[PDB]
Subunit: 261 residues, 4 copies
């Protein structure tokens, strides 16, 4: 509709993790609303295919320009400058208006009894240090105002942990805590978290392989909706946050009712 | 966008409290999307005015049709019947797809030291008994599926009480509890709560108006009073995200951080 | 210091005849406090009262008394609560109040619920604790040394199918606590939210099915076992001692909330 | 010190990481009043001296309670896992540890967000997150996983009420709470919990910053270390409580 369109037409949106899954669907919604979308990822092959997919999305507002950049989020010595370059690129000729930091990763970490300091800090680098640094650099490329937003991603497993996942559960709690600290330190910019549940992404399919349909019966049994989330469903939550200039400091839970059980 | 119109075009939406404030702005957004709005109020003049305000809305979709229906939420002997009639109207010739229960809920109650049992029960009737009775009657007019949603309203004062408001704080906590119980008992229907704060509505606003606003602006991190149209986007979002159920969506300008 | 926080203090336990309330009363008199238990059945009150006077670990100075109070009789509710508070104040003032949960049985289906049924839950779970708060200042100093503790339940967050009315009022108790923590400051007001506790009442209800239900609860927990009333009663005693804690919901529910 | 409370703790081994001062010291007091064996740990050796001597000469101490100390620097990364392992081995002694308390890293404002560096981010995490993570790694070697025992971590009210300039600390306080829940599952049926204190007056802290907290609270006063210490003791005794954040912060969270 025109008011959603006017909320976001011509606005720059950076989507870290936009190659597939939730980020890609956010990118689709962004350009359907007339916004400029910059997607970032770790894989140039994946990034290239996602980028053409967006350019010829038939529901793309013709006005929407799509661009891409490759950014390595585990390279500690160059992380701040890589992130600084990404934001420069995303700002382009003006300023960034909305940042989405997606987290679509769940690879079970080693057993607690074997975890190492190196392993701990790697998850933190990706889950904690990088979002902090984007916040540090952000005022150069984005106006701190409530028309703009910076959105992070945690997960329902922060509240309902699976056994074997304590390192990841811990940094998920850290993302939600970081959001709250940043909502104060970056005011009047709006900072929020989306906390998704089980989402049926292509990589989720591929991981589970033959084990897919078992895991999905579990997730449906655990939900109250009785069905697995579409990435398109979850992406609406990030778009809502862009539109509502009143929402900041909160964790938006879109997880099929699993948290009720 | 086409995606959003496709989700809501032709859907029956009941806004309880749609004559003014957030409910009115929710009615606006849903008719922009081609949905069939039915607004309910307690004041017939206010209704007719709002109903007419809506029917003339500029961005209104031509196919969107608006109706109104009076319903006193405090008349306990007739409450179940009025809600049943209201539900029957909003369904029309098919079914209701989305129910929004909004409230302009901020008139301060009597002091704790003086509050009486009928005063407690009167807030209990509007805040708790009425949403429960909508839930009781809802399956007759509405399918229990995750395409559909039923959204209640609490408020940031549920978490940040002001002195004098303990009775309204309590029943806000009851609204949020009720939502979670209903999200289970009525599954796979989706049931949620929107918890607004720092929104300026006509009824809310006159001379003291700008004192309290400054208390909200200073308490917030947006440094800005919010328009009903901002908060309305939360109700619309819940209608669209067929994954969201059982949660309290907090749109209150960052006041909860401070 | 911590040994004398409770010695000589006047405690009121509403629902002190069995289960959690009774175990609170036990801990209270072990610490030397004066306990007034309230309940709805004079015979069960009588049994509870004797069992507390006879408690071997009761501090000698600790005096126990009882009072009957129908929390569903609306026309007499405010006066009955006033009389209960007068009693518990003894010859000085109340210092701590505990209000244990109704622990009701499953209500009728949602499609069957009536206004009368809704308000009856509200009377016991919301109106009665509200009226205690209204009346309290006449009999009790509003200060951080004293405390007023309500009771919700882990099913406030994890609803059981068919219980929406009880789940709703459980969230009302928690909201009321927060409202009261503000309107009654600097008195401390808190909520204990217990999970699966094996009270004597419970074992009668489940009866033959008890071992099924206890393996279910154990499976949902991370402790792997069912809580004792004496375990949960430690939380109420804690709140009485920590003069810094107010406005919060204390969750003691075996880790079920992690699942 | 009731018989019921002493039975629960008498003879138990309790490790208190950060027991030299403040909340940790007060927990050490309460546990030895119960006849439990307290082992305190600290970064500063003669600050341990003070504490260790002060503890040992406490008036309400159960005659049978023993006290002992150890140093452990939670920032020295090359030596962190071993010093923690050595610490745990000490507290277990000739049996097992029964209760662990990890008292929080203190409230020193970090650099302004605009100037924070990766080295700065990672050192708050080493102490607030890595160290308790490593204690959990090593614990099973020295502690039984049963609901009679507990591992208690510490976050803080600023996890939910940030102050300007504290985003890094608020960040890892949420990490501590998330870690507690994950460990509450991974280490079941051991009980793991978080105490979240607020408005607490300790000597390293101890008038404008003290009236300011009083105005945000509903108790209207600054709480003592001895009040919040009761929370840690409660969690030891309630064999039903796990996976939760116990908020003892004077009602500041209501405002």
């Amino acid at each position: 509709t025109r008011r959603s369109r006017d909320l976001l037409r011509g606005k720059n949106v950076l989507i870290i993790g936009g190659t597939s899954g939730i980020g890609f669907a956010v990118a689709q919604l962004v350009i359907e609303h007339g916004a400029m979308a910059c997607i970032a990822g770790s894989n140039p092959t994946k990034l290239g295919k996602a980028l053409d997919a967006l350019k010829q999305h038939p529901d793309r507002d013709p006005i929407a320009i799509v661009q891409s950049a490759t950014c390595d989020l585990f390279d500690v010595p160059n992380l701040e400058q890589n992130l600084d370059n990404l934001l420069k690129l995303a700002a382009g000729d003006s300023k960034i208006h909305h940042i989405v930091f997606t987290a679509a990763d769940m690879v079970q970490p080693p057993p607690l009894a074997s975890v190492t300091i190196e392993q701990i800090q790697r998850v933190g680098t990706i889950r904690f240090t990088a979002p902090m640094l984007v916040a540090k650099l952000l005022p150069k490329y984005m106006e701190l105002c409530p028309e703009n937003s910076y959105t992070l991603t945690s997960g329902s497993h922060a509240k309902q942990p699976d056994p074997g996942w304590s390192l990841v559960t811990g940094y998920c709690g850290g993302v939600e805590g970081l959001m709250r600290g940043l909502a104060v330190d970056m005011m009047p910019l709006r900072v929020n978290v989306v906390s998704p549940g089980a989402v049926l992404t292509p990589v989720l399919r591929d991981i589970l392989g033959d084990s897919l349909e078992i895991a999905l019966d579990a997730a449906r049994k655990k939900s109250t909706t009785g069905r697995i989330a579409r990435p398109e469903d979850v992406a609406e939550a990030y778009l809502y946050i862009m539109k509502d200039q009143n929402i900041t400091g909160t964790v938006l839970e879109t997880s099929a009712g699993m948290l009720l059980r």
